[PDB]
Amino acid sequence: LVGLVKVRVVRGVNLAVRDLRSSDPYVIVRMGKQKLKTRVIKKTTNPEWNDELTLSIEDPAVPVRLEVYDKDTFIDDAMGNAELDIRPLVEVVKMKIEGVADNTVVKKVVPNRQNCLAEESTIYISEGKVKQDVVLRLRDVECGEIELQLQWVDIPGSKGV
Ligand SMILES: [K+]
Ligand SMILES: [K+]
Numbered sequence: 001l002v003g004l005v006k007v008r009v010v011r012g013v014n015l016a017v018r019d020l021r022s023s024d025p026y027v028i029v030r031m032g033k034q035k036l037k038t039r040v041i042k043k044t045t046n047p048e049w050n051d052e053l054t055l056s057i058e059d060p061a062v063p064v065r066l067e068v069y070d071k072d073t074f075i076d077d078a079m080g081n082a083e084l085d086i087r088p089l090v091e092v093v094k095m096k097i098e099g100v101a102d103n104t105v106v107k108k109v110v111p112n113r114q115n116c117l118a119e120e121s122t123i124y125i126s127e128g129k130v131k132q133d134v135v136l137r138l139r140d141v142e143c144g145e146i147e148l149q150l151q152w153v154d155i156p157g158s159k160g161v
Helices: 087-093
Strands: 003-013 025-031 034-037 051-057 064-070 078-084 104-109 121-126 129-137 145-153
Touching (some): 003 087, 034 051, 087 121, 087 145
Antiparallel strands (some): 003 051, 003 145, 025 034, 025 064, 064 078, 104 121, 121 129, 129 145
């Protein structure tokens, strides 16, 4: 492993309705074959999950994938998906910035037609730590955004594989 990334799934905003008036949403978060899930919150389209899911990083070029679903007795309807590139986070990690003020913004990632960003994403230092604030717009669904906060975790050493 090269490190860990704490993915705090903060909230879903205006998610799709999949059970007539509301939904029972959860997120599956993947990095390749690695997969984790948030809790389910019942009968909301604005879930305040605030669930932190920690991914082991082996290859930072593999996207982090997020899939939202409705929990249901018969079929768990999809409620959109998105993905995120953690290479910008890793780029800032490699700058080895230390000793600065909290919330020192050092890199910004802009939305474009290929990525899933809803707005400019900021990568910042709150020491020792490298963090990223992300809002993702969901694909393959009529509405919905997911708000995330990422945090890099270094794996202490020990060096030379
Ligand atoms: K349904
Ligand atoms: K449901």
